[PDB]
Design a protein around this ligand. Structure first.
Ligand SMILES: COc1ccc(-c2ccccc2N2CCCC2=O)cc1
Length: 186
Protein backbone atom coordinates (compact mmCIF):
# COMPACT_ATOMS: atom_id res chain seq x y z
CA UNK A 1 0.00 0.00 0.00
CA UNK A 2 0.92 3.76 0.10
CA UNK A 3 1.95 3.84 3.78
CA UNK A 4 3.71 0.48 3.82
CA UNK A 5 5.64 1.57 0.79
CA UNK A 6 6.68 4.86 2.46
CA UNK A 7 7.93 3.03 5.53
CA UNK A 8 9.89 0.44 3.52
CA UNK A 9 11.58 3.26 1.48
CA UNK A 10 12.38 5.27 4.64
CA UNK A 11 13.96 2.34 6.48
CA UNK A 12 16.72 2.13 3.86
CA UNK A 13 18.04 5.54 4.99
CA UNK A 14 17.81 4.99 8.80
CA UNK A 15 21.16 5.76 10.43
CA UNK A 16 19.85 4.57 13.87
CA UNK A 17 21.73 5.62 17.04
CA UNK A 18 25.15 5.77 15.37
CA UNK A 19 25.71 9.58 16.09
CA UNK A 20 23.44 9.90 19.21
CA UNK A 21 26.13 9.55 21.93
CA UNK A 22 28.55 12.33 20.70
CA UNK A 23 29.03 15.28 23.13
CA UNK A 24 26.97 18.01 21.42
CA UNK A 25 24.20 20.44 22.51
CA UNK A 26 21.35 18.18 21.31
CA UNK A 27 18.00 18.99 19.59
CA UNK A 28 15.48 16.73 17.79
CA UNK A 29 12.77 17.40 15.15
CA UNK A 30 9.74 15.35 14.07
CA UNK A 31 8.95 15.20 10.30
CA UNK A 32 5.22 14.28 10.53
CA UNK A 33 3.74 12.41 7.53
CA UNK A 34 -0.06 12.62 7.08
CA UNK A 35 -2.15 10.78 4.45
CA UNK A 36 -5.09 12.90 3.08
CA UNK A 37 -7.17 12.45 -0.05
CA UNK A 38 -5.06 9.62 -1.32
CA UNK A 39 -1.66 11.46 -0.99
CA UNK A 40 1.11 12.10 1.59
CA UNK A 41 1.59 15.50 3.22
CA UNK A 42 4.10 16.98 5.71
CA UNK A 43 2.93 18.95 8.74
CA UNK A 44 4.68 22.26 9.55
CA UNK A 45 4.45 24.87 12.35
CA UNK A 46 4.81 28.61 12.40
CA UNK A 47 6.74 29.39 15.57
CA UNK A 48 5.49 31.93 18.11
CA UNK A 49 7.42 35.26 18.40
CA UNK A 50 7.89 34.75 22.16
CA UNK A 51 10.32 31.87 21.48
CA UNK A 52 14.05 31.36 22.04
CA UNK A 53 15.15 29.75 18.76
CA UNK A 54 13.65 30.56 15.34
CA UNK A 55 10.90 33.08 16.32
CA UNK A 56 8.17 33.57 13.67
CA UNK A 57 9.73 30.96 11.32
CA UNK A 58 8.28 27.93 9.54
CA UNK A 59 9.74 24.84 11.28
CA UNK A 60 9.04 21.15 12.04
CA UNK A 61 7.89 20.35 15.60
CA UNK A 62 11.01 19.93 17.84
CA UNK A 63 13.33 21.35 20.49
CA UNK A 64 16.08 20.74 23.07
CA UNK A 65 16.68 17.39 24.72
CA UNK A 66 16.14 17.36 28.52
CA UNK A 67 17.10 14.92 31.29
CA UNK A 68 13.69 13.17 31.20
CA UNK A 69 14.11 11.97 27.57
CA UNK A 70 15.01 8.25 27.26
CA UNK A 71 16.58 8.91 23.83
CA UNK A 72 16.56 11.48 20.95
CA UNK A 73 13.25 10.15 19.51
CA UNK A 74 11.65 10.84 22.92
CA UNK A 75 12.68 14.53 22.66
CA UNK A 76 10.95 14.84 19.28
CA UNK A 77 7.67 13.23 20.59
CA UNK A 78 7.66 15.29 23.84
CA UNK A 79 8.03 18.50 21.94
CA UNK A 80 5.39 17.57 19.28
CA UNK A 81 2.89 16.89 22.13
CA UNK A 82 3.62 20.23 23.75
CA UNK A 83 3.31 22.21 20.49
CA UNK A 84 0.36 20.60 18.64
CA UNK A 85 -1.15 18.01 21.01
CA UNK A 86 0.15 14.91 19.25
CA UNK A 87 -0.11 11.96 21.61
CA UNK A 88 2.10 8.87 21.53
CA UNK A 89 -0.48 6.39 20.37
CA UNK A 90 -0.99 8.78 17.39
CA UNK A 91 2.53 8.49 15.92
CA UNK A 92 4.79 5.67 14.68
CA UNK A 93 8.48 6.71 14.47
CA UNK A 94 9.81 4.94 11.37
CA UNK A 95 13.39 6.17 11.20
CA UNK A 96 16.20 8.56 12.03
CA UNK A 97 17.62 10.51 9.07
CA UNK A 98 21.06 12.09 8.78
CA UNK A 99 21.65 14.65 11.52
CA UNK A 100 22.34 18.32 10.89
CA UNK A 101 25.63 19.93 12.29
CA UNK A 102 25.30 23.59 13.24
CA UNK A 103 27.29 26.37 15.01
CA UNK A 104 30.29 24.01 15.70
CA UNK A 105 28.75 22.68 18.95
CA UNK A 106 25.17 21.56 18.04
CA UNK A 107 23.67 18.42 16.49
CA UNK A 108 19.95 18.29 15.38
CA UNK A 109 18.56 14.77 14.84
CA UNK A 110 15.49 14.35 12.51
CA UNK A 111 12.91 11.54 12.93
CA UNK A 112 10.18 10.64 10.41
CA UNK A 113 6.80 9.77 11.95
CA UNK A 114 3.56 8.38 10.42
CA UNK A 115 0.53 10.19 11.88
CA UNK A 116 -2.82 8.56 12.71
CA UNK A 117 -5.75 9.50 10.41
CA UNK A 118 -7.91 10.70 13.38
CA UNK A 119 -5.30 13.19 14.70
CA UNK A 120 -6.34 16.84 14.64
CA UNK A 121 -3.85 19.57 15.54
CA UNK A 122 -4.50 21.76 18.57
CA UNK A 123 -1.98 24.64 18.21
CA UNK A 124 -0.61 25.70 21.60
CA UNK A 125 -0.42 29.51 21.20
CA UNK A 126 2.47 29.87 23.68
CA UNK A 127 4.61 27.83 21.22
CA UNK A 128 2.99 27.94 17.83
CA UNK A 129 1.16 30.64 15.82
CA UNK A 130 -0.09 28.32 13.03
CA UNK A 131 -0.03 24.63 11.79
CA UNK A 132 -0.38 23.73 8.04
CA UNK A 133 0.06 20.77 5.67
CA UNK A 134 1.96 20.70 2.34
CA UNK A 135 1.62 17.87 -0.15
CA UNK A 136 4.90 15.94 -0.28
CA UNK A 137 4.95 16.17 -4.12
CA UNK A 138 5.22 19.98 -3.94
CA UNK A 139 8.89 19.59 -2.95
CA UNK A 140 9.75 18.02 -6.34
CA UNK A 141 8.59 21.16 -8.23
CA UNK A 142 8.57 23.98 -5.69
CA UNK A 143 8.04 27.71 -6.37
CA UNK A 144 11.56 29.07 -5.67
CA UNK A 145 12.51 32.68 -4.71
CA UNK A 146 16.08 33.92 -4.15
CA UNK A 147 16.79 36.24 -1.14
CA UNK A 148 21.95 34.52 -2.73
CA UNK A 149 19.83 31.84 -0.96
CA UNK A 150 16.81 29.65 -2.00
CA UNK A 151 13.33 30.02 -0.43
CA UNK A 152 10.15 28.07 -1.27
CA UNK A 153 6.71 29.78 -1.39
CA UNK A 154 3.65 27.61 -0.84
CA UNK A 155 0.11 28.89 -1.23
CA UNK A 156 -2.69 26.85 0.43
CA UNK A 157 -5.53 26.47 -2.17
CA UNK A 158 -8.10 26.25 0.68
CA UNK A 159 -7.57 29.91 1.73
CA UNK A 160 -4.86 31.57 -0.46
CA UNK A 161 -2.42 32.01 2.45
CA UNK A 162 1.24 32.00 1.49
CA UNK A 163 4.03 30.43 3.59
CA UNK A 164 7.81 30.73 3.18
CA UNK A 165 9.86 27.58 3.87
CA UNK A 166 13.66 27.87 4.05
CA UNK A 167 16.92 26.60 5.58
CA UNK A 168 17.15 23.20 7.32
CA UNK A 169 13.35 22.82 7.16
CA UNK A 170 13.28 23.21 3.33
CA UNK A 171 16.30 20.89 2.95
CA UNK A 172 14.75 18.06 5.03
CA UNK A 173 11.42 18.39 3.15
CA UNK A 174 13.18 17.85 -0.21
CA UNK A 175 15.06 14.88 1.21
CA UNK A 176 11.88 13.09 2.44
CA UNK A 177 10.14 13.78 -0.92
CA UNK A 178 13.09 12.22 -2.84
CA UNK A 179 13.23 9.11 -0.61
CA UNK A 180 9.49 8.36 -0.83
CA UNK A 181 8.54 9.56 -4.38
CA UNK A 182 11.59 8.84 -6.65
CA UNK A 183 11.19 6.21 -9.39
CA UNK A 184 7.46 5.40 -8.96
CA UNK A 185 5.09 3.82 -11.55
CA UNK A 186 1.81 5.75 -12.32
C1 LIG B 1 11.51 23.19 16.55
O1 LIG B 1 12.75 22.50 16.49
C2 LIG B 1 13.91 23.21 16.47
C3 LIG B 1 14.07 24.56 16.13
C4 LIG B 1 15.34 25.11 16.11
C5 LIG B 1 16.47 24.35 16.40
C6 LIG B 1 17.83 24.94 16.38
C7 LIG B 1 18.69 24.72 17.46
C8 LIG B 1 19.97 25.24 17.48
C9 LIG B 1 20.44 26.01 16.43
C10 LIG B 1 19.64 26.26 15.32
C11 LIG B 1 18.36 25.73 15.27
N1 LIG B 1 17.55 26.01 14.11
C12 LIG B 1 17.15 24.96 13.16
C13 LIG B 1 16.21 25.65 12.19
C14 LIG B 1 16.43 27.13 12.41
C15 LIG B 1 17.12 27.25 13.75
O2 LIG B 1 17.28 28.26 14.41
C16 LIG B 1 16.28 23.00 16.71
C17 LIG B 1 15.02 22.43 16.75
Amino acid sequence: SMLDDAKARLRKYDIGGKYSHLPYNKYSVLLPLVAKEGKLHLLFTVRSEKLRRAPGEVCFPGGKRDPTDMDDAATALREAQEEVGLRPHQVEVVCCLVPCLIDTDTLITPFVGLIDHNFQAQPNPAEVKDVFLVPLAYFLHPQVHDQINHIFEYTNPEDGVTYQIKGMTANLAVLVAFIILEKKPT
